[PDB]
Amino acid sequence: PASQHFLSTSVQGPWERAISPNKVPYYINHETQTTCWDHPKMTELYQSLADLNNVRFSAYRTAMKLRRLQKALCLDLLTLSAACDALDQHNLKQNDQPMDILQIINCLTTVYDRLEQEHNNLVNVPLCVDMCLNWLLNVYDTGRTGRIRVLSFKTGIISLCKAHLEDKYRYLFKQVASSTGFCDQRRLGLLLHDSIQIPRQLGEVASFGGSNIEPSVRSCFQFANNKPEIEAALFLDWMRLEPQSMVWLPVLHRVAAAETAKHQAKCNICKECPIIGFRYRSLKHFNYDICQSCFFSGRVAKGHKMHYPMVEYCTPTTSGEDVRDFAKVLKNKFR
Amino acid sequence: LHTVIPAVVVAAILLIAGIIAMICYRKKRKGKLTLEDQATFIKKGVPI
């Protein structure tokens, strides 16, 4: 294409942009044998992302960027039921079934037709199909072979859809467990590998233990009391234990919920009242409430302490609960 | 006197009503509006 020479200079060094038979451009990381795509709309999206390197912590960064992507991709308009019906309509039930470009295109069309019928003024089917194919083959097509697995695509869509966190957990467990509902080390490892293929695409894989899924499986099966197989309830409990390699999805759910939160409080640095979004309350001092705008920059008022405990309200508070925790912090400061 | 002064004792009941109202400014309607996620619990207290 004529845009190859024009936009090959948008990135430099080892990155090597190449075109695909489906006329979608993609970069090449040749010695890692890993490849990623970059559409011009996703190019400007990533350029906007690159200015948002101000997040101090890891999980917050991943959740905020993934929320920005999901809202930009308009895949937050997709529910669990529509995606499940679309995947069951194309008979993509075997997790190890090879998937060509055409089957993914058909399933994406099935999803996005319903999405546009619900969001005529918000969803454009061909552009959204191109964007979602771009992202999915970014995550799970690093080899440029045109073949992916049904399980990885299912995991990506279910994680990036609009549904309850435990509902997505249960569906993914059913996808990876057998007909008896049992999951051994290998299926859990495959699911964790598919999950860890996501942060490496953006560049925050090492902060959560790297790409080594073995410690995660070891922790999960140690919580399983060394059981040969794990169950859905034990999987949910271990997930609520907030492991290192999976906390990003509940952090995403929280930030999505708190995006519409409005707290009647004042920021104890930038004096912003009312607090909109995330409210953070210190568990040591009194009358100290900070907004996430100053929290993410790392600026601290009155300095930190030997220990500086913090609670993170993501929803408008209940007066009973905050009076209880105020009584707790008075009790703590009394001692 | 009984027709004038015991007309103020009802202000004590007025206090009782005001107090019991004010011990419940968030217990009156806990759900309030925009009742999303009504079968689980979403709260955090540790920075990650």
Side-chain angles (χ1 to χ4, degrees), chain A residues 1-334, chain B:
Chain A
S3 76
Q4 182 64 41
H5 312 323
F6 178 53
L7 303 163
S8 74
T9 59
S10 81
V11 75
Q12 296 88 20
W15 279 126
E16 172 191 352
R17 202 263 294 279
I19 207 70
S20 65
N22 215 356
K23 67 194 80 67
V24 184
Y26 59 89
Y27 296 149
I28 292 185
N29 211 4
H30 64 279
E31 299 300 306
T32 56
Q33 287 74 236
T34 53
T35 61
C36 72
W37 319 70
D38 200 3
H39 197 272
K41 290 202 179 296
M42 258 174 68
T43 306
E44 71 92 11
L45 207 47
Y46 284 154
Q47 277 163 0
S48 57
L49 288 196
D51 313 326
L52 305 185
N53 270 343
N54 65 331
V55 191
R56 176 159 186 148
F57 288 88
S58 45
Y60 298 85
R61 199 150 55 240
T62 66
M64 184 60 186
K65 264 158 202 169
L66 183 62
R67 187 57 170 131
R68 172 67 264 172
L69 265 293
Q70 190 201 19
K71 267 189 166 172
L73 276 296
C74 307
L75 196 59
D76 48 328
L77 321 173
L78 167 67
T79 177
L80 171 69
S81 66
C84 278
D85 297 333
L87 62 91
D88 287 321
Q89 268 156 2
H90 293 277
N91 306 287
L92 319 177
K93 297 165 184 161
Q94 302 182 1
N95 283 338
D96 313 318
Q97 202 182 348
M99 276 305 118
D100 64 332
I101 315 172
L102 187 56
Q103 262 171 313
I104 311 163
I105 283 171
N106 298 352
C107 190
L108 211 44
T109 314
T110 317
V111 172
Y112 274 136
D113 286 338
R114 303 190 221 168
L115 274 192
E116 186 196 56
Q117 290 298 322
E118 297 178 9
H119 299 268
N120 287 310
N121 285 346
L122 279 177
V123 167
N124 174 259
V125 170
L127 191 73
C128 284
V129 161
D130 199 271
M131 295 299 102
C132 183
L133 272 157
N134 182 345
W135 185 90
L136 281 152
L137 304 174
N138 274 301
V139 184
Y140 295 122
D141 205 28
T142 45
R144 289 316 173 241
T145 73
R147 182 256 175 197
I148 66 154
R149 314 193 295 189
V150 189
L151 187 59
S152 297
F153 163 79
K154 276 180 170 178
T155 317
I157 301 299
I158 295 309
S159 313
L160 263 71
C161 80
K162 172 60 187 72
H164 284 86
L165 209 69
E166 83 281 347
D167 295 354
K168 303 167 171 211
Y169 290 156
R170 205 170 314 277
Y171 179 77
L172 291 185
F173 185 82
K174 179 194 167 190
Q175 274 324 294
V176 305
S178 64
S179 180
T180 59
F182 286 101
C183 184
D184 62 345
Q185 282 86 354
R186 290 183 181 175
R187 299 148 173 268
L188 174 61
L190 293 163
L191 181 65
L192 286 172
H193 169 272
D194 298 6
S195 304
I196 204 67
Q197 296 294 321
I198 316 165
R200 53 143 190 86
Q201 211 271 351
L202 277 296
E204 208 62 35
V205 65
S207 302
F208 307 101
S211 306
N212 196 359
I213 50 181
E214 181 60 44
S216 306
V217 186
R218 277 186 288 160
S219 172
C220 188
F221 274 81
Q222 274 161 359
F223 181 61
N225 298 338
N226 211 357
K227 267 172 178 188
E229 298 166 314
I230 67 172
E231 289 180 30
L234 192 138
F235 176 75
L236 294 174
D237 291 341
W238 185 78
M239 187 44 224
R240 268 73 169 272
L241 290 183
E242 292 324 298
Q244 186 54 257
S245 48
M246 206 59 73
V247 72
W248 54 272
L249 187 75
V251 182
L252 166 64
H253 183 259
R254 275 167 49 241
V255 72
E259 267 169 324
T260 177
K262 284 178 285 296
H263 304 104
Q264 306 270 351
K266 173 253 291 180
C267 174
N268 281 60
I269 297 170
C270 81
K271 312 305 165 198
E272 174 188 8
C273 185
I275 294 302
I276 296 185
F278 267 103
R279 159 175 170 182
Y280 308 137
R281 167 74 192 106
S282 194
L283 296 175
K284 189 172 178 172
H285 305 340
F286 297 154
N287 303 358
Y288 280 6
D289 284 283
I290 181 69
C291 78
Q292 82 274 16
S293 78
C294 295
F295 190 86
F296 290 154
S297 314
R299 41 205 170 186
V300 288
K302 310 300 184 182
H304 68 94
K305 313 303 289 178
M306 300 296 291
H307 179 54
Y308 45 105
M310 191 80 66
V311 66
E312 295 88 359
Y313 295 89
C314 53
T315 188
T317 74
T318 299
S319 298
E321 204 276 326
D322 57 58
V323 175
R324 289 280 82 76
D325 69 38
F326 287 161
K328 288 151 202 162
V329 71
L330 276 296
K331 178 183 180 181
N332 288 130
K333 258 210 174 171
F334 177 80
Chain B
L1 192 155
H2 313 324
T3 72
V4 161
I5 279 297
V8 76
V9 174
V10 65
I13 297 89
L14 179 138
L15 188 147
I16 294 167
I19 302 182
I20 65 170
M22 204 57 32
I23 67 169
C24 298
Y25 208 90
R26 275 292 82 92
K27 302 305 288 188
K28 169 256 166 193
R29 190 174 185 170
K30 182 179 182 180
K32 191 179 180 183
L33 290 177
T34 312
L35 277 296
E36 290 171 354
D37 195 68
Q38 277 322 93
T40 54
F41 179 73
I42 300 300
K43 182 190 180 67
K44 184 178 184 292
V46 54
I48 306 285

